[PDB]
Amino acid sequence: RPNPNKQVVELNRTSLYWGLLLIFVLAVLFSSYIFN
């Protein structure tokens, strides 16, 4: 039976830019410590 509780996730371009910036900045910050 189809589920009434159905919804779709959305992510506008601003959220994509924020996420990419966040992950790249975290990688930049932690690369020196990970490589040691």
């Binding site: 601003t14 830019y17 990419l20 910036l21 790249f24 900045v25 990688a27 930049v28 690369s31 490589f35």
Partner: peptide, 30 residues
Amino acid sequence: MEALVYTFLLVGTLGIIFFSIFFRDPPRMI
């Protein structure tokens, strides 16, 4: 090797900044 990785990370971050500044979602109904 590690210097190349750092340079790639910095270049990618700068590219993301450039794309966000220029290829942005046009704001409507502020």
